[PDB]
Design a protein around this ligand. Structure first.
Ligand SMILES: CN1C(=N)N[C@](CCC2CCCCC2)(C[C@H]2CCN(C(=O)CC3CCCC3)C2)C1=O
Length: 387
């Protein structure tokens, strides 16, 4: 019910990631670690890098164990490579436990570390199926649950500020909470609604209906989950499959048509600015994603505001934003800008993901984010994509 020791243990922002403090080795080496529900390796900087002010020094840890194996992880926008080993790991603002976990000691990388992000490694919280080099490398959370009495569940409250935070502010500000082993009721309002985890690899879910200001996008629901839909704190944007993105942007443009925005804005490349305090939130539509419910033929919806999908960026005294919805060729990605609207419960023990309105979501006096249900929805299993 209440996990005060873990409340407010995150820092960061949607554009650069949310991170938690961790310690590795004996004596403990403190590092800031990206919370990543879209990968499954615990991988930390272990050699000098221009964007790192600290890194894991294996030679200084008496509990370091060398697995004598390399790991090469190339991905779309970057790469990381390192040396596998194990060590004792703790989360200072977490459960009061120390676990023996796998650690990939990063020795070389490209477009992995971000200048000014304040994190030195990543915590892959998804399942062993997508761990590198293969599923035999036990992910951190699996080790934590196996070695302690920590319940097999974690929950995330990612807090977007609603305005830009400079270098000093982002270091001093609370970015949210990662509750390990439980649900903290102070982090949300209303009810938690659960969607099934379709398969344990990424945190895969099924979207059954999409609305833009109550208007049904009216696409075959398979299109929404082509080739998968995942919940990923390690992605900034709400990413949509090509056809869905094209249909959604046409509908968002139509709803906001009292103001014309350049093509570069809709491409998520160019910022849009308004005089201080005059952002016309009301012209932008709300977006509802209906998710498969736990009950047969039942769904629920999560509704986000433009305060979630317009990402605050510094320009002046103008309030500026980037459009945080973008195209994908690898399925839907419910990234940090979506997660910022909600308290998200990764209930691994019951193979389900919970959503509730976040106590820290940004809104205005007229509209709020929402999590509502139930809705009668038929043939929802057909919304899932196969092959
Ligand atoms: C999309 N995504 C993740 N969720 N994690 C990784 C890895 C995915 C693995 C999936 C399984 C197979 C191997 C690759 C790596 C992170 C590291 C930094 N990254 C940023 O984009 C910078 C920030 C932008 C907002 C938060 C971070 C991405 C990724 O590419």
């Amino acid at each position: 019910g209440s996990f005060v020791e873990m409340v407010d243990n995150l820092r960061g922002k949607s554009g650069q990631g949310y991170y938690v403090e961790m310690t590795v080795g004996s004596p403990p080496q403190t590092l800031n670690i990206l919370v990543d529900t879209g990968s499954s390796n615990f991988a930390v900087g272990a050699a000098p890098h221009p964007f790192l002010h600290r890194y894991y020094q294996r030679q200084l840890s008496s509990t370091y164990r060398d697995l004598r194996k390399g790991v090469y992880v190339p991905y779309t926008q970057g790469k990381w490579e390192g040396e596998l080993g194990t060590d004792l790991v703790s989360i200072p603002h977490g459960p009061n436990v120390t676990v023996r976990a796998n650690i990939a000691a990063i020795t070389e990388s490209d477009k992995f570390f971000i200048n000014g992000s304040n994190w030195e490694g990543i915590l892959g919280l998804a399942y062993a199926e997508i761990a590198r080099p293969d599923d035999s490398l036990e992910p951190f959370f699996d080790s934590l649950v196996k070695q302690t009495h920590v319940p097999n569940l974690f929950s995330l409250q990612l807090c977007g500020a609603g305005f830009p935070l400079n270098q000093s502010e982002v270091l001093a500000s609370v970015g949210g909470s990662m509750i390990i082993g439980g649900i903290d009721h102070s982090l949300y309002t209303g009810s938690l609604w659960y969607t099934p985890i379709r398969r344990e690899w990424y945190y895969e879910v099924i979207i059954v209906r999409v609305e833009i200001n109550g208007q049904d996008l009216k696409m075959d629901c398979k299109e929404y989950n082509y080739d998968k839909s995942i919940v990923d704190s390690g992605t900034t944007n709400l990413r949509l499959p090509k056809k869905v993105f094209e249909a959604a942007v046409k509908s968002i443009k139509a709803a906001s048509s009292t103001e014309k925005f350049p093509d570069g804005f809709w491409l998520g490349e160019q910022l849009v600015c308004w005089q201080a305090g005059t952002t016309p939130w009301n012209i932008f539509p709300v977006i509802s994603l209906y998710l498969m419910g736990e009950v047969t033929n039942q769904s629920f919806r999560i509704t986000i505001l433009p305060q979630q999908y317009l990402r605050p960026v510094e320009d002046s005294q103008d309030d500026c934003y980037k459009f945080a919805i973008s195209q994908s060729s690898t399925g839907t990605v419910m990234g940090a800008v979506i997660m910022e609207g909600f308290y998200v419960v990764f209930d691994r023990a019951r193979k389900r993901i919970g959503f509730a309105v976040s106590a820290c979501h940004v809104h205005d006096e007229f509209r709020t984010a929402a999590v509502e249900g139930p809705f009668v929805t038929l043939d929802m299993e057909d919304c899932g994509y196969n092959i």
